[PDB]
Design an enzyme around this catalytic site. Structure first.
Site, short mmCIF file in Angstrom:
data_model
loop_
_atom_site.label_atom_id
_atom_site.label_comp_id
_atom_site.label_asym_id
_atom_site.label_seq_id
_atom_site.Cartn_x
_atom_site.Cartn_y
_atom_site.Cartn_z
N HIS A 31 9.45 -2.53 71.90
CA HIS A 31 9.15 -3.95 71.63
C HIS A 31 10.45 -4.71 71.80
O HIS A 31 10.19 -5.95 71.73
CB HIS A 31 8.46 -4.20 70.26
N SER B 201 11.31 1.60 64.77
CA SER B 201 10.23 0.78 65.33
C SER B 201 9.87 -0.36 64.35
O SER B 201 9.85 -1.46 64.87
CB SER B 201 8.91 1.60 65.47
N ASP C 13 6.46 3.00 71.20
CA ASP C 13 7.46 1.92 71.03
C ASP C 13 8.78 2.51 71.57
O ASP C 13 9.60 2.94 70.72
CB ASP C 13 7.50 1.54 69.57
N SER D 32 15.58 -2.73 64.45
CA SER D 32 14.70 -2.06 65.46
C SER D 32 15.53 -1.56 66.62
O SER D 32 16.48 -2.23 67.07
CB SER D 32 13.72 -3.06 66.06
#
Lengths: 4, 198
Positions: B36, B159, B63, B143
């Site tokens: 992401h 994530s 992810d 992240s």
């Protein structure tokens, strides 16, 4: 939950 | 820039994420991070300088992503811990109950234990399946950062989690935290990458  | 697990990088001059791990793909230098964080071809910058672009990513579902860097970048087999470093020694996957720490630009280095594997996160964009859950705290911006054991076994890249209104899950008891990471193994085999170790 959330991204991050 | 010196590439170290845990440091901040920006994507297209807008979003911030954290570097997961230095890796190589043949003669190409790169770092793995969260899917992401960017789309293919998004530009990554470290301390205001262009260091590479997103070469591939998968999100949601999984992810994950890898950024291929320019030749001038210095890959290091290390993860930031404050002013010190944790050396990357390999990628043995730890079991439920193992102690683990994570590193990222918002909360720094936090440790806790793995509490469950194969968890599904229902993100607004779609579900992400197969995440491992730990109870180390994390915040918005962490992240993509490294998840590693103090012995240097790289576990995965951050994530998401159940962040509160302050932007992290550090003000709630460990027993109530759900901090999720994408396993590193499948990312290395999917992209044909090799971890840089020391």
């Amino acid at each position: 939950a959330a991204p991050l | 820039a010196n590439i170290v697990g845990g440091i901040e990088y920006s994507i297209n001059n807008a979003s911030l994420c954290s570097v997961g791990f230095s890796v190589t793909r043949g003669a190409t230098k790169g770092f793995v991070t969260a899917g992401h964080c960017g789309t293919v071809n998004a530009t990554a910058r470290i301390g205001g300088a262009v260091v590479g672009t997103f070469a591939a990513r998968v999100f949601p579902g999984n992810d994950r992503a890898w950024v291929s860097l320019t030749s001038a970048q210095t890959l290091l087999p290390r993860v930031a811990n404050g002013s010190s470093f944790v050396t990357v020694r390999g990628s043995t996957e730890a079991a439920v109950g193992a102690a683990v720490c994570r590193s990222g630009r918002t909360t720094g280095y936090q440790c806790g234990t793995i509490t469950a594997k194969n968890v599904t996160a229902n993100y607004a964009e779609g579900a992400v399946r197969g995440l491992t859950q730990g109870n180390a705290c994390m915040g918005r911006g962490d992240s993509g950062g490294s998840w590693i054991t103090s012995a240097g076994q790289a576990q995965g890249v951050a994530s998401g989690g159940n962040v509160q209104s302050n932007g992290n899950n550090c003000g709630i008891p460990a027993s109530q935290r759900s901090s999720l990471f994408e396993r590193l193994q499948p990312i290395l085999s999917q992209y044909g990458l090799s971890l840089v170790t020391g």
